[PDB]
Each structure stands twice: as C-alpha cells, then as structure tokens.
Design a protein around this ligand. Structure first.
Ligand SMILES: CN(CCS)C(=O)c1cccc(F)c1
Ligand SMILES: CN(CCS)C(=O)c1cccc(F)c1
Ligand SMILES: [Cl-]
Ligand SMILES: [Cl-]
Ligand SMILES: [Mg+2]
Ligand SMILES: [Mg+2]
Ligand SMILES: [Mg+2]
Ligand SMILES: [Mg+2]
Ligand SMILES: [Mg+2]
Ligand SMILES: [Mg+2]
Lengths: 235, 8, 235, 8
C-alpha cells in the first residue's frame, strides 16, 4: 500500500507519526520504506525499531491482561463465563503473532543479508531475537522449543559479533545484552545465566567509560542502569 | 517492579 | 463483521477490551451490539461512549499535533518541506471524520428514534452534539456553518429535555452542560455564553446537593469540579 | 491548562 510513496516521504511521515504518537502508522510507513529495497541508515533503523516496539508493546500488555483474566477463570470456584475470554485472548494473540511475523519477514527479506557493518548486523540480529522472544512469550505448542531456540540463535550470533567488533560501552551491544539476559531469565528458565550476563556486561562497560565523551558516557550509563535495575530485582 | 528490556 | 456474534458476547468482549485498553476493539464490539437492533441499557450506553470517546480522543490529539506542525510550516521563514505534512494531517483528519460519521450513523439508525426515557434521549443527543463538535473542530469549508449548527441543535434539544425532566445534579445533565459550554467557548465564539452556562449549571447543582445520598453527591460534585475548572481557566 | 470536557 506504500509502493506509490517516495522513500523520503515515508521516512518524513514516520517521524510525524512518532510526534503524533501514531505508532501503527509509523510502523506502516517504515515497512514501506524497508520494502523500497535500499539499506537503512542508523536513524532509519531506530525509527523502524521504535515503531514496531510500540505496536507490539501495546499488544503484549493487552495479552497479559487477558491471559490473567483467563487464568482466574479456570481456577476452582470460578463461574463458567463461556468461550469469550479465550476467544478474545486468541484474537489479540493472533494479531501480535502477525506483527512479529511481519518484522521477522522484513529482517529475512532482505535486511539481514545486506547488513555488513557490525552496527547494522548486530541491530538486526538483536531485533530477530526480540521478535522470536515475543512469539515465545505466547507459545504453547509443538514448535515452542524451536521458537525459543530461534530467539537464542539470533541473540547468540549478535553477541558473538558485538564482542568481536564493538566496545563494551556501545549502546547496541549493551541493549542486546540486556535483552538476551531477559531472555535467559524469563524464557529459557536460566536465571543464573541472566544474572551472570547482566553483571559481566555492566562491569565491562564500567571499565571502558573512561574512554568516552560526556555525551557517549550519558548514552552508555543510561543502559547500564537498566542492567542494574534488573540485577537489583533478581538478587 | 517489571524487569527492564531495551525500549524507547 | 460482528453479525455472527451474540449480543451478550459482544458486550462481554467490550468490557474485556476496556480492561486491556484496546479501545478500537471496544468500539467495534459496541457497534456490533448496537447493530443487533435492541435498545441499550444505561451500562451499555456508557460502554459505547467510553469506547468511541477514547478512539476519537486519540485521533483529535494527533490531529492537533499535526495541525500545529503544518501551521509552523506556513510561517514566513520556514523551509519548504513538500506536501507530506498536509497529506498526513489530511489522512488523520479523514479517519477522524469517519469515526464521527460512524457514531452519528448509529445514533441516526436507530438509537435516537427509539430512546423515550429522558436519561437515554439526553445521553444520545449529547453524543450527537459531541460528534458534530469534533467534526466542527476540523471543518474549514462550505458546510462548516451547517456542521456547527447541527452540534448546536442537538445540544439544545438535549438541554431542553434535561431541564424539564432531570434534577440539576443529574450527571448526564451536568456533563451535557459542561460540553455545550465548551461548544460555546471554543466553536461558536461565544465565551460569555459559555461562562454563563457553566456558572448557572454549577450554582443550580450546588443548591440541589442537599437532596442526595453520599454516593450521588460524589458523582455530581466530580462533574461540578470540571465546570469550576473551566470557569477558573476562562475568568 | 486544557479546558475540561466530559470524559472517562
Ligand atoms: C537507549 N537505547 C534503548 C534502550 S537499550 C538504545 O540505544 C538502543 C535502541 C535500540 C536497539 C539497541 F540495541 C539499543
Ligand atoms: C462522570 N461522567 C463523565 C464526565 S461528564 C459522567 O457521568 C457522564 C458520562 C457520559 C455522559 C455524560 F453525560 C456524563
Ligand atoms: Cl474475539
Ligand atoms: Cl499520508
Ligand atoms: Mg523514488
Ligand atoms: Mg551492505
Ligand atoms: Mg568496531
Ligand atoms: Mg442472539
Ligand atoms: Mg424505547
Ligand atoms: Mg425525571
């Protein structure tokens, strides 16, 4: 539906949609921009990420509300209210899965294969792990282990590149480690791995802060605080 | 009280 | 699209959508419920109102953001950025107009004509004034005066009924007066009428509070405070 | 600072 709009106009309108808090529109504009077939700049990658994270974030929050109601409905002593809670949870779940599949499809056709610089490749592989992780959050059936392993594999490739090619304070490296640590804690039932990763990431970043400008220091320490927040919650 | 992931 | 779902299931799912902050879904469920052709109860009327007010409220807020950007773009000294701001403002405006037309269509087919009790009739006529008012907020062309007059006429019929049939503390009567006063201030360029209406409404409610239970007193005084908030802003 | 209308 965006095929007739100029790439630059799609990017301009994505920024307007962000200012207006119209994240579904923002995501549709950025999908159109990706589908023009050119690589994305750093700024454009962050617009793509902001848009879809906000869309899926609303869906995930709604899914958790509905899942909790459904859980309470199946406790002993609960009155039978019919199929409606399950149906509506399933409706929201299917829409969420559709958004994840859309993002994964953009990554596979063809953002990842054309991404050669570490900053872009790690960014996209982190995104791939993230959207498999969101699929894992709602998965219950025969492919659940494979969904979890797909998240793990994408995160692991991103980590390997990030450790070789980026300083320990790089914000993409830090955000990747934050999210892989959450994956370990919440998805893979590996809280010790989650804690170890968060701590090592924090400590290695701390030791590299001395190399940074004031502005880079602000960027890196903001994400380090997110790691610390999780360590405080988990220990 | 909800753990943090990479957002904004 | 809701024709195959039971009325009771639509209402149940509207309440679930509200809990999940899924207001577009909530509105679609309530539209389906209205289209079953039966009258709405008090609770169901309030679900319809909550759903569409949240949907249109997001659109209106986005429209104002985009309209402000567009205004700044046409000031002297602004760099020409092309048609994109106007196009995107128009896109959001058209979607907003569509939602207003949908609500007005439900009121006309056939909620208002079957509403005989004062509580329901005033509620629906207030709603009619509200959605014409939202159309007026974005109107610029040949029918703008007629849109404004349609809002005025609906509000005026609701006021006439409310004064004859409801006590001055009734929350629907109070909310109607609040909104008609905003209409006068913001749409009809009649700030004195807006102030007079808010003050008389507040004072007449104050004099009737002595007749109320604790719970009714809480309901009425909450809306009276909204009237006072506007009087403080406007004087 | 924005005037009130009937909401919630
Ligand atoms: C501050 N911040 C977000 C919190 S991690 C980032 O820099 C960032 C954004 C997107 C992907 C990523 F790996 C990092
Ligand atoms: C508290 N409250 C909302 C603020 S006016 C109401 O009671 C109400 C809701 C919908 C329509 C109406 F006329 C009144
Ligand atoms: Cl459903
Ligand atoms: Cl547009
Ligand atoms: Mg072109
Ligand atoms: Mg390349
Ligand atoms: Mg490097
Ligand atoms: Mg039936
Ligand atoms: Mg009737
Ligand atoms: Mg009466």
């Amino acid at each position: 539906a965006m095929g007739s709009m100029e790439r630059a106009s799609l990017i301009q309108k994505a920024k307007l949609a962000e200012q207006a808090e119209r994240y579904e529109d923002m995501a549709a504009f950025m999908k159109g921009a990706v589908e023009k077939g050119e690589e994305l700049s750093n700024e454009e990658r962050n617009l793509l990420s902001v848009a879809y994270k906000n869309v899926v974030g609303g869906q995930r929050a709604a899914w958790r509300v509905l899942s909790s109601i459904e859980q309470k409905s199946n406790e002993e002593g609960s009155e039978e209210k019919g199929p409606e809670v399950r149906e509506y949870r399933e409706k929201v779940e299917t829409e969420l899965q559709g958004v994840c599949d859309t993002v994964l499809g953009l990554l596979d056709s063809h953002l990842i294969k054309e991404a050669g610089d570490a900053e872009s490749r790690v960014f996209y592989l982190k995104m791939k792990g993230d959207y498999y992780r969101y699929l894992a959050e709602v998965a219950t059936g025969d492919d659940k282990k494979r969904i979890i392993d797909s998240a793990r594999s994408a995160y692991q490739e991103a980590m390997d590149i990030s450790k070789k090619e980026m300083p320990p304070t790089n914000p993409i490296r830090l955000g990747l480690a934050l999210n892989f640590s959450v994956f370990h804690y919440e998805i893979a039932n590996s809280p010790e791995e989650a804690i170890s990763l968060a701590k090592t990431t924090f400590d290695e970043a701390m030791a590299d802060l001395h190399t940074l400008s004031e502005d880079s220091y602000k960027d890196s320490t903001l994400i380090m605080q997110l790691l610390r927040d999780n360590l405080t919650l988990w220990t | 009280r909800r753990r943090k992931s990479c957002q904004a």
